[PDB]
Enzyme design. Structure first.
Site, PDB file in Angstrom:
ATOM      1  N   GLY A  27       0.778  -1.227   0.000  1.00  0.00           N
ATOM      2  CA  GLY A  27       0.000   0.000   0.000  1.00  0.00           C
ATOM      3  C   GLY A  27       0.810   1.278   0.000  1.00  0.00           C
ATOM      4  N   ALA A  30      -1.883   7.632   2.668  1.00  0.00           N
ATOM      5  CA  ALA A  30      -1.968   9.100   2.670  1.00  0.00           C
ATOM      6  C   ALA A  30      -0.695   9.753   3.234  1.00  0.00           C
ATOM      7  CB  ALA A  30      -3.205   9.562   3.437  1.00  0.00           C
ATOM      8  N   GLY A  32       1.776   7.866   4.650  1.00  0.00           N
ATOM      9  CA  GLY A  32       2.859   6.914   4.443  1.00  0.00           C
ATOM     10  C   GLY A  32       2.679   5.744   3.483  1.00  0.00           C
ATOM     11  N   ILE A  33       3.800   5.067   3.267  1.00  0.00           N
ATOM     12  CA  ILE A  33       3.901   3.807   2.548  1.00  0.00           C
ATOM     13  C   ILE A  33       3.788   2.679   3.565  1.00  0.00           C
ATOM     14  CG2 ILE A  33       5.343   2.411   1.004  1.00  0.00           C
ATOM     15  CD1 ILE A  33       6.076   6.090   1.469  1.00  0.00           C
ATOM     16  N   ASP A 145     -14.814  10.268   8.961  1.00  0.00           N
ATOM     17  CA  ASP A 145     -14.241   9.929   7.683  1.00  0.00           C
ATOM     18  C   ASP A 145     -14.099   8.447   7.457  1.00  0.00           C
ATOM     19  OD1 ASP A 145     -13.348  11.079   5.119  1.00  0.00           O
ATOM     20  OD2 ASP A 145     -11.328  10.427   5.676  1.00  0.00           O
TER      21      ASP A 145
END
Ligand code: J6F
EC number: 2.7.11.24
Length: 352
Positions: A27, A30, A32-33, A145
């Site tokens: 993945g 947002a 981070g990786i 959210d």
């Protein structure tokens, strides 16, 4: 003998503790990786998220900090738990990156949404979303959210929420990454003040996507999104406009009107497992619940408590899962800071 080593994933360098092995990218989120890895100490796989220079701006910095504090002190089967935190850098001045280590699940809700679930599973997923949300709500965390990409599942249908949502206040961010609006409540789109049941809207949007296999309200911007909403549910009755600010109320009372559709029409019988009697009765119950969650006016929208008491959901009810002791939270947790100050705050939290 440094405690860390370095490996490439795309254009990222992950520098992690030696325990974590066989890093595989899963993945590009947002802040981070994310990587899957085997942890040789615990003897299990784990997810590892790199936060890069999370102090770069105030939005990154508030999210990172909020994430850190909440994850340390929330303990619930339905909210992803933190196994480990660390930075390779050795002092405040060299400090750059934060790594969160979390339990690894098998998929996110996005993948689940493209499959046909039986009712026992769909209802179990939903029950678990409501438990996690109830828990947040009991510590006074309102999420605002929920979205299928921050929800993850195991093979055995257990589910966990990845994040803690928006920061109460909020703002701008220089990015190629656009943030998803599709699950946000009418009260948030119209900036009108919200309560707990603001998260029920998002749930109903996710359940609705689960059934229809199509994002319910796929708008490019909040304008478009509001249109996709009223097209289907119909224009909210006068009483709801009365609650809006005259500036936005003006805009709202001025859209083309819609009688809007009925729930049988919105979610037809064909979409549900409905061959046995069990399944026909469940389908009916499923559609009933959707009709109470997808209600524009939050005064008329169902609450988390009622939706757990709902027939479709009620089957799974456990008071251990639903009435778990609230998290004890830091107080000013909607604060403003310079970037230098955020670095301090986060670093202190990474180090304890
Ligand atoms: C080869 C297994 C793929 C499962 C991906 C699920 N997943 C995604 S996607 N992101 C996260 C997870 C996860 O399980 N735990 C996490 O902490 N995060 C951030």
């Amino acid at each position: 003998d440094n405690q860390f080593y370095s490996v490439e994933v795309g254009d990222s360098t992950f520098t992690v503790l030696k325990r974590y092995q066989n890093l595989k990218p899963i993945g590009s989120g947002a802040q981070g990786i994310v990587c899957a890895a085997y942890d040789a100490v615990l003897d299990r796989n784990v997810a590892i998220k790199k936060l890069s220079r999370p102090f770069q701006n105030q939005t990154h910095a508030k999210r990172a900090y909020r994430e850190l504090v909440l994850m340390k002190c929330v303990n619930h089967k339905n909210i992803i738990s933190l196994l480990n935190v660390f930075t390779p850098q050795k002092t405040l001045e060299e400090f750059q990156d934060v790594y969160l280590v979390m339990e690894l699940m098998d998929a996110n809700l996005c993948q689940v949404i493209q499959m046909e679930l039986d009712h026992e599973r769909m209802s179990y997923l939903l029950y678990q979303m409501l438990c996690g949300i109830k828990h947040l709500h009991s510590a006074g965390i309102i999420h605002r959210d929920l979205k299928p990409s921050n929800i993850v599942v195991k093979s055995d249908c257990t589910l966990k929420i990845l994040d803690f949502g928006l920061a109460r206040t909020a703002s701008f961010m220089m990015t190629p990454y656009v943030v998803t609006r599709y699950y946000r409540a009418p009260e948030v789109i119209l900036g009108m003040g919200y309560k707990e049941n603001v998260d029920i809207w998002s749930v109903g949007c996710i359940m609705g996507e689960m059934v229809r296999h199509k994002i319910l309200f796929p708008g490019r911007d909040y304008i478009d999104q509001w249109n996709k909403v009223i097209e289907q549910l119909g224009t909210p009755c006068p009483e709801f406009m009365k609650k809006l600010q005259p500036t936005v109320r003006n805009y709202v009372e001025n859209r083309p009107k819609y009688a809007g559709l009925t729930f049988p029409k919105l979610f037809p019988d064909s979409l549900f497992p409905a061959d046995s009697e069990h399944n026909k009765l469940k389908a009916s119950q499923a559609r009933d619940l959707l009709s109470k969650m997808l209600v524009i006016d939050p005064a008329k929208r169902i609450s988390v408590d009622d939706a757990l008491q709902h027939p479709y959901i009620n089957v799974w009810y456990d008071p251990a899962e639903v009435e778990a002791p609230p998290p004890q939270i830091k107080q000013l947790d909607e604060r403003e800071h310079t970037i230098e100050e955020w670095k301090e705050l986060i670093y202190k939290e990474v180090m304890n």
